[PDB]
């Protein structure tokens, strides 16, 4: 008798978090068949850094984290380690020594709305870039230049967030894409998340 990991709760969720407020669930004390995901064909992106999907079912880790969020199709490339741009710098930043995988798929038929889906938001302004796995959920008025803002929107003072406004008629590069990031942390503690081959 084996305890299987709750992946469907993460992959098959009614709502995904906005990338700026990305969601993280801990995976522990279960058995995960990773080859099921790698060979699912439903994922437009499946890139693993620090390991190979072929050996995932034979490896064990002490902790597994699933980070989920929605971004544009043309922003999925920024999830890889050592990239830059609006998402990598201001919203979600993977470390350069990242050990895990990056899984995305098109969600135009789930997260798009006629007239725009403004529920999915991204951070547009930030003075310093995000550090790996950092989460900034602030909504303070961003100040550009020297003029103080007094907490009001104006000529040099802007709201830090902006909606995606996903529409089903948008081009594929702009369509919503659900992303799931699996991180494989391994310490000198007992490993609790394993593949079927161990």
């Amino acid at each position, epitope marked *: 008798i084996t305890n299987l990991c709750p992946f469907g709760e993460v992959f098959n969720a*009614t*709502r995904f*978090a*906005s990338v700026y*407020a990305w969601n993280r669930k801990r995976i522990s004390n279960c058995v995960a068949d990773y080859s099921v995901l790698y060979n699912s064909a439903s994922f437009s992106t499946f890139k693993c850094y620090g390991v190979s999907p072929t050996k995932l079912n034979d490896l064990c880790f002490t902790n597994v984290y699933a980070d989920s969020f929605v971004i544009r199709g043309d922003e999925v490339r920024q999830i890889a380690p050592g990239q830059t741009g609006k998402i990598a710098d201001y919203n979600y930043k993977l470390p350069d020594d990242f050990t895990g995988c990056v899984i995305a798929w098109n969600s135009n*038929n*789930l997260d798009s*709305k*006629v*007239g*725009g*889906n*403004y*529920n*999915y*938001l991204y951070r547009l302004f930030r003075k310093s870039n995000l550090k790996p796995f950092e989460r900034d*959920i602030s*909504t303070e008025i961003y100040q550009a230049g020297s003029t103080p803002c007094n907490g009001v*929107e104006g000529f040099n003072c802007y*709201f830090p*967030l*902006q*909606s995606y*406004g996903f529409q089903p008629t948008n081009g594929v590069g702009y369509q919503p894409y659900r992303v799931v990031v699996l991180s494989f942390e391994l310490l000198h503690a007992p490993a609790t998340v394993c593949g079927p081959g161990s």
Partner: antibody, heavy 126, light 109 residues
């Protein structure tokens, strides 16, 4: 803590005009979508219109039965939403509610109306 | 223009019984469906958002399920304070929000 209070409205002859206001407090009005929803006597809820927040364009959308006659505007300076009604018909006789959605946190669900006002009755007759 | 349809129009159940209210859309609205409770003389109260999510403070007796064009509101154990008209509302078409005609829920005693 969040509250909305409609004001204005009452008896008005057909073809007249009224301006409903509703006052916001306890939440950042500038960050919230604002909507109007009416209900005639024992007739059910009907969406009237909505104005988005400034950050998403501040554009308005109106239901078909009122397009061209009702004008929705917001005044973030005073935390007040407005509905300018014109060419009023007896079919417009209803209770008018002002409302905002479930986006005042990290999880955003626009057009899910969790905060409602008490509603002001608008009667249209001779 | 998506039109929302509710059934039944009115129902009457005893206290502690399970009640079901269905909602139909003229076209798929994905998961953008909300349920509201409006007691007589009061403003509507949001019960369920995103098809299945329960609004904070709402009793656990209320639940919702569905997707696409068909949805259901369930009350596991009807209480006397649950007398009201229940409305479903779609937000798939952002520029044109529409409600259902509503279902009157009454108490048998």
């Amino acid at each position: 803590v969040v509250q909305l209070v409609e004001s204005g409205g009452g008896l008005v002859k057909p073809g007249g005009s009224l301006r409903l206001s509703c006052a916001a407090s306890g939440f950042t009005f500038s960050y919230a979508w604002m909507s109007w929803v009416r209900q005639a006597p024992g007739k059910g809820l009907e969406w009237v219109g909505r104005i988005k927040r400034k950050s998403d364009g501040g554009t308005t959308d109106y239901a078909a039965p009122v397009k061209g006659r009702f004008t929705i505007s917001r005044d973030d300076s005073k935390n007040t939403l407005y509905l300018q009604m014109s060419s009023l018909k007896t079919e417009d006789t209803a209770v008018y509610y002002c409302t905002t959605d479930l986006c005042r946190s990290t999880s955003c669900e626009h057009d899910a109306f969790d905060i409602w006002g008490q509603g002001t009755m608008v009667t249209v007759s001779s | 223009d998506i039109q929302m349809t509710q059934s039944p129009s009115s129902l009457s159940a005893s206290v502690g019984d399970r009640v079901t209210v269905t909602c139909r859309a003229s076209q798929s609205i994905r998961s953008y469906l909300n349920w509201y409770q409006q007691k007589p003389g009061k403003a509507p109260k949001l019960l369920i958002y995103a098809a299945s999510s329960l609004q904070s403070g709402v009793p656990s007796r209320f639940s919702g399920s569905g997707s696409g064009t068909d949805f259901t509101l369930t009350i596991s154990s009807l209480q006397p304070e649950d007398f009201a008209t229940y409305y479903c509302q779609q937000s798939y078409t952002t520029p044109a929000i529409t409600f259902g005609q509503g279902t009157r829920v009454q108490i048998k005693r």
